[PDB]
């Protein structure tokens, strides 16, 4: 459970899933819809942006005609990497590594939400909540490994946006938002629950 | 348009009129060049006589050994043929400006210029190029 400076402790509620901070404002974040009736979750690990491929950068080009083609090839493969994510119908995209502005705007046109800048401990909680799996390659994506839930709705919580998942038939996760006045109030509610949860 | 040359030494009476323009710079003499030349035509060199090294980065690659030999030969020729064309115009005195990013006159080029009896003077200020062209009536030369 995470910290939310601001609010009153009485207005908390029970959540059947996860609620994680985005921690970054993308260029095409507002274009995506905030409400999906039948969302589908797919966890990624590949970095979706235009950069060096595998820990190195060195490209020799002799002819100027091929210099135009090698740039178009980089633009070709990056959309080929994104199109494989689009063809399976993954509405929610999540990745530990950053996601560039090129990818999030491609997803923003056809109503596909995406997010990034999340920790590995948060990612492991996402898999057990939705019941999916981790896929670090876009070519080996299949329909069966996609997680699902009842609905999706991003709500304003303490001047911070959180992506809510809830209503799963079988959820392994319980994660409640701790809102309070001072930073010690939310801390005391955490330690009190952490001591009580171990007893039960 | 008036020029005053500052110099230490001498006496006040030594100040006199000079009918023509005087150069504050001195000769290199590094190579054995002329320092006087009667009935000489003064040409203003506004470029640099130096090994080829153009604006875009130039990485020279040597694949075979004949090539090391050739690169040297070709250069001892890029300076020679340019100096050969100076003999065609019979220009006897050259004046080079201050060179940036490289040497103004290569030491290998001074051997060709010193044997053909050509005075070489470098490290002239840029603003004085208007003075020399206006006085001597010589238009600058930026390319062969």
């Amino acid at each position: 459970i995470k910290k939310i400076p601001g609010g009153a402790m009485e207005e908390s509620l029970f959540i059947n899933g996860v609620a994680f901070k985005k921690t970054f404002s993308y260029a095409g974040f507002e274009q995506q819809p905030k409400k999906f009736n039948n969302p589908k979750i797919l966890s990624l690990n590949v970095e979706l942006e235009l950069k060096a491929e595998k820990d190195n950068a060195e490209v020799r080009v002799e002819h100027v005609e091929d210099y135009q083609a090698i740039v178009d090839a980089e633009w070709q493969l990056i959309f080929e990497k994104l199109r494989q994510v689009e063809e399976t119908g993954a509405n929610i995209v999540l990745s530990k590594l950053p996601i560039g502005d090129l990818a999030t705007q491609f997803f923003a046109d056809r109503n596909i939400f995406c997010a990034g800048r999340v920790s590995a401990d948060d990612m492991n909680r996402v898999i057990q909540a939705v019941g999916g799996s981790i896929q670090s390659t876009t070519s080996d994506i299949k329909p069966e490994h996609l997680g699902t839930c009842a609905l999706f709705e991003e709500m304003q919580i303490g001047s911070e946006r959180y992506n809510l998942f809830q209503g799963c038939p079988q959820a392994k996760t319980c994660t409640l938002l701790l809102r309070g006045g001072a930073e010690q109030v939310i801390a005391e509610v955490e330690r009190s629950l952490h001591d009580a949860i171990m007893i039960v | 348009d008036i020029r005053l040359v500052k110099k230490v030494g001498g006496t006040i009476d030594d100040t006199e009129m000079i009918d023509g323009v005087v150069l504050t710079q001195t000769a290199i003499k590094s190579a054995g060049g002329p320092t006087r030349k009667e009935k000489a035509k003064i040409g203003l060199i506004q470029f640099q006589i130096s090994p080829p090294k153009p604006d875009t980065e130039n990485n020279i690659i040597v694949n075979d050994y004949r090539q090391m030999d050739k690169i040297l030969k070709e250069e001892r020729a890029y300076l020679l043929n340019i100096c050969k064309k100076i003999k065609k115009a019979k220009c006897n005195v050259l004046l080079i400006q201050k060179s940036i990013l490289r040497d103004a006159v290569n030491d290998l080029a001074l051997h060709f210029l010193s044997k053909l009896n050509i005075m070489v003077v470098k490290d002239i200020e840029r603003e004085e190029i208007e003075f020399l062209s206006k006085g001597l009536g010589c238009k600058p030369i930026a390319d062969i």
Binding site: Q184, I197, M198 | -
Partner: protein, 50 residues
């Protein structure tokens, strides 16, 4: 118990563990209480004070 360490980090707690920790105990015999609090807090998580 209200404690403020050298870095001016405010904290309010009643747990043996947090309180003892927010305290850099240099005495050797007194750190036995710190160990059993962390040992009780790590496994059970209640009754540390007791």
């Amino acid at each position: 118990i209200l404690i403020v360490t050298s870095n001016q980090k405010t904290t309010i707690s009643n747990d043996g563990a947090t309180i003892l920790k927010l305290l850099d105990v240099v005495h050797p015999a007194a750190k036995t209480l710190v160990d059993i609090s962390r040992a009780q807090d790590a496994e059970v998580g209640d009754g540390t004070t007791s």
